[PDB]
């Protein structure tokens, strides 16, 4: 039913829309939907929306570039060697989509959580941050998360102002007489640990001195960057 009425509708999509969709459907980090020549993905973890309009050429793509979608707008075209940003929209050869959507996924980083009351129960609310600026920076340097660097969360200690990696935070707060488990909310700064530079950068590409981190984080960084 919602199988044939599914196979029939799908089969009637334009070849182009099918081709583009076939580039993205394996990226299960996103929930996908198709409507006409528009492919919409919803990042499963963060709920970030990605709208992909399929166009026949650059003129069309450029015309669609001007579009608010309350999320990431991408215009996919069959033209090769095309990759630029116009009016905030990505305009790219559809063969760059898979790599682009994956880079986008790598840039939607968990930054904290908050526990909220809800219908008599406590519910955890996660905070995600789409690092678009860093995304563009990494694409230009052909930098790949997990390969040339990784994003990692550090907590800004309300006691010494030093940055401590999330894992050593428990022990760190303990030494201050503060119990981590009694906290019902926390926010972290997301830093980049660059394997190439053997240095730490903020989410904007700016380098961060090592003295900004607690003695614990310091060695952790040293450990990771090796």
Look up residue 96 and give its DSSP letter: G
Our CB check for Zn ion shows the closer of 158 and 223 to be: 158
Phi, psi of 198 (to 5 degrees): 60, 35
User: Taking the complex as a whole, how short is the minimal distance between the CB of residue 154 and Zn ion, in angstroms?
Assistant: 12
Taking CB under 5 A as the rule, does residue 170 contact Zn ion? Answer: no
Task: Judge contact between 125 and 176, C-beta under 8 A.
Answer: no
Our CB check for Zn ion shows the closer of 97 and 169 to be: 169
User: Taking the complex as a whole, how short is the minimal distance between the CB of residue 214 and Zn ion, in angstroms?
Assistant: 6
Our CB check for Zn ion shows the closer of 138 and 172 to be: 172
User: Taking the complex as a whole, how short is the minimal distance between the CB of residue 157 and Zn ion, in angstroms?
Assistant: 3
Size of site (CB under 5 A) for Zn ion: 3
Our CB check for Zn ion shows the closer of 129 and 216 to be: 216
Our CB check for Zn ion shows the closer of 5 and 181 to be: 181
* Residue 145 neighbours by CB distance under 10 Å: 18
| Distance of alpha carbon 173 from alpha carbon 69, whole angstroms | 42
Question: Per-residue x/- marks for Zn ion, 134-163, CB under 5 A?
Answer: -----------------------x-xx---
Q: Among all residues, whose Cβ is closest to Zn ion?
A: 157
H-type helices in the chain, by residue range? 4-11, 15-24, 58-64, 97-106, 132-140, 169-174, 215-224
Closest listed residue to residue 151, CA positions, set 134, 167, 164: 134
Residues that bind Zn ion (CB under 5 A): 157, 159-160
């Amino acid at each position: 039913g919602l199988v044939p009425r599914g196979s029939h509708m799908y089969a009637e999509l334009s070849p182009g829309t099918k081709k583009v969709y076939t580039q993205v459907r394996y990226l299960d980090d996103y929930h996908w939907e198709i409507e006409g020549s528009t492919i919409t993905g919803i990042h499963k973890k963060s709920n970030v929306k990605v709208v992909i309009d399929v166009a026949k050429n650059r003129e069309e793509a450029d015309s669609l570039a001007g579009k608010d979608v309350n999320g990431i707008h991408i215009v996919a075209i069959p033209d090769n060697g095309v990759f630029y940003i116009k009016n905030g929209s990505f305009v790219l050869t559809y063969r760059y989509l898979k790599a682009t959507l994956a880079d986008i996924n790598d840039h939607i980083v968990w930054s904290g959580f908050k526990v909220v009351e809800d219908n008599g129960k406590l519910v955890q609310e996660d905070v995600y941050e789409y690092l678009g600026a860093a995304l563009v920076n990494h694409i230009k340097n052909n930098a790949l998360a997990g390969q040339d660097y990784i994003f990692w969360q550090f907590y800004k200690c309300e006691e010494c102002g030093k940055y401590v990696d999330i894992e050593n935070l428990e022990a760190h707060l303990r030494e201050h007489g503060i119990k981590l488990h009694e906290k019902s909310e926390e926010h972290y700064e997301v830093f980049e640990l660059n394997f190439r530079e053997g240095k730490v950068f903020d989410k904007f590409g700016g380098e961060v001195p090592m003295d900004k981190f607690s003695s614990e984080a310091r060695e952790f960084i040293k450990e990771v960057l090796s």
